[PDB]
Design an enzyme around this catalytic site. Structure first.
Site, PDB file in Angstrom:
ATOM      1  N   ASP B 186       0.831  -1.203   0.000  1.00 42.78           N
ATOM      2  CA  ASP B 186       0.000   0.000   0.000  1.00 42.78           C
ATOM      3  C   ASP B 186       0.869   1.258   0.000  1.00 42.78           C
ATOM      4  OD1 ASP B 186      -1.812   2.043   0.441  1.00 42.78           O
ATOM      5  OD2 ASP B 186      -2.834   1.016   2.097  1.00 42.78           O
ATOM      6  N   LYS B 263     -14.251   0.480   2.452  1.00 44.33           N
ATOM      7  CA  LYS B 263     -14.154   0.808   3.867  1.00 44.33           C
ATOM      8  C   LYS B 263     -15.469   1.425   4.300  1.00 44.33           C
ATOM      9  CE  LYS B 263      -9.210   1.629   3.922  1.00 44.33           C
ATOM     10  NZ  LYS B 263      -8.129   2.540   4.353  1.00 44.33           N
TER      11      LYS B 263
HETATM   12 MG   LIG Z   1      -4.839   1.978   1.692  1.00 43.87          MG
END
Ligand SMILES: [Mg+2]
Ligand SMILES: [Mg+2]
Lengths: 341, 341
Positions: B186, B263
């Site tokens: 990431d 998310k």
């Molecule tokens: Mg991320």
């Protein structure tokens, strides 16, 4: 846990022959589905197969009862997503897929002491359905239109597609004697691209407004649907061209239509939910329709519409056109209005 | 029906400072949400606002407690779609929208006598989360990687983005001492398009495989995400670029990414459900992540993941990085494994 799944042939007669582009029906052959849980709870669904739209045949649906039993018996309805994934393999029997999936939710809602509409969000308490005027002479079409209007329906669905000149004439006449009503025109794939546009322009020129113009061209002609959308003043909808969530995803990407007529008989519960989300994430608008469901079958769509509250228009008049001894839906019907108990 | 809503600040300190591209955190300040039903049932949720990702600030969330209360009280949780629609207006307070929407399902499931995961489909009984290695010296990253591997985690998420050369070295070193594990890299928007491609090609050359390559470029650079996807061997994911269902539809239409890291803190339950449906109706694949949730907050994602069973990878480790008095999730955890009771 599911301990049994039953499929049953149920025949229903239409008040009078139902005529749409390339099809005349006087009978509606459905397959009733019952799911029994070990707890004793029983869920019900109904499949109204379409040879023309889904390539299905009632005899074929009935012939696979045992396979359907083997696929989901032993599965707990609280794990309904597993049942949905498994029944999605029945893409060749979409109407049965829908019945089984709904019966599953029907059973599950009972175990949870609630209703299917609430399980789906309980967004609305009431919805109104239009009523259809089948193809006939202009005279008879106007007659039926008046009767429907006198019954309280403020949204009238007009079938066309076999005779452009007469279809235009019919819509114009109907409009004269039903001032105050909205209109939905459904050509069931009968027009060519240019014919479809001519129809809309001709009617528009008379000052008539069409709320939804359903599938004017052939099912594979996505470019044609788009052509009509971009050259016609009225909202164009895909019906026969929109069966799966993948078809809709494609129609949205192509900016092919303003509307999609979702039908559980085409998509089942799983794809119907996906299509609702797809529409709400784009400019697409929806309407929910039906095939030849009896009251028990329309019940599936009523709960879906009430729960998601995702539709601008509802064409759930199938049970109203069939002679049925006893009402069998888990909802209340009051004229064009439909509510839940 | 909801008779009251209460917001309250809850602070959690990190075992050690958490370093990611352009941000170091020593503590997580969350806002707990509690909804009270006339029946006495209480639903709980947790908001973990992000200033960097969502533009949110803890003080601002706490400041609108009364407004939220006025928005949802008086609504029956069985009509949750209504609550979802209303809370969608809190697009400026995404994390709060999530907490409220989940608290709603938490309360609803209690009344129905089930759990949130089953309400969402009950697709899976178990999921596995990875664990993150924050930015640090190559030596410390390697040390934390070995420790995570020893704890049983077989998917290791590695943060990069501030030093291309050191990042490559870090990933290469971690891979040598964790043979058998899969890796998620990431960058948190730290690389230019070409640097992102070079990072991937270099790792690939050393024979290392990356499961998911998260948000390599700036959030507004959609064509950059696509460029990386089409010019590097590993699956590319959108995180910061994918907040709403509309962002996702755009990413799909433009074929910008292979993955979307969903998310709840960015989308809330409503948009997350739409994104799951969009992904299943296209080539898009999904992973579910988190911000700085404590055990109570992670629980929201665990139930979402278990119920939908829609994710290939799970990055639900924030609670494992925070020092917490007592566990507060409605789920069981054994190492990387998470199941429901
Ligand atoms: Mg991320
Ligand atoms: Mg139609």
């Amino acid at each position: 846990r599911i301990v049994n799944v039953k499929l049953s042939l149920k025949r229903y007669e239409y008040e009078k022959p139902f005529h749409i582009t390339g099809s005349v029906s006087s009978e509606s052959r459905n397959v009733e589905v019952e799911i029994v849980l070990e707890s004793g709870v029983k869920g019900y669904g109904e499949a109204s197969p379409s040879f023309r739209v889904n390539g299905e045949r009632v005899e074929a649906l009935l012939a696979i009862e045992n396979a359907v039993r083997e696929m989901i018996t032993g599965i707990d309805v609280r794990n309904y997503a597993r049942i949905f994934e498994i029944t999605d393999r029945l893409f060749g029997f979409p109407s049965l897929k829908a019945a089984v999936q709904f019966a599953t939710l029907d059973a599950l809602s009972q175990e949870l002491g609630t209703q299917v509409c609430y399980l789906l969000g309980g967004k609305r308490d009431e919805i109104e359905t239009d009523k259809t005027v089948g193809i006939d002479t202009v005279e008879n079409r106007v007659k039926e239109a008046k009767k429907i209007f006198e019954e309280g329906f403020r949204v009238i669905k007009i079938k066309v597609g076999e005779n452009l000149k007469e279809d235009i004439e019919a819509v114009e006449e109907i409009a004269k004697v039903t001032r105050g009503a909205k209109y939905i025109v459904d050509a069931n794939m009968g027009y060519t691209q240019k014919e479809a546009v001519e129809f809309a322009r001709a009617v528009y020129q008379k000052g008539i407004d069409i709320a939804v113009y359903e599938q004017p061209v052939r099912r594979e002609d996505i470019e044609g649907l788009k052509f009509v959308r971009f050259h016609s003043p009225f909202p164009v909808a895909a019906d026969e061209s929109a069966r799966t969530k993948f078809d809709v995803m494609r129609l949205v990407k192509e900016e092919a239509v303003d509307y999609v007529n979702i039908k559980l008989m085409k998509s089942g519960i799983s794809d119907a939910l996906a299509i609702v989300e797809i529409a709400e994430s784009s400019g697409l608008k929806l309407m929910i329709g039906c095939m030849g469901e009896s009251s028990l079958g329309i019940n599936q769509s009523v709960h879906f519409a009430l729960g998601t509250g995702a539709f601008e228009f509802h064409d759930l008049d199938s049970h109203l056109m069939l002679k049925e001894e006893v009402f069998r839906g888990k909802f209340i019907q009051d004229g064009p209005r439909m509510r839940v108990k």
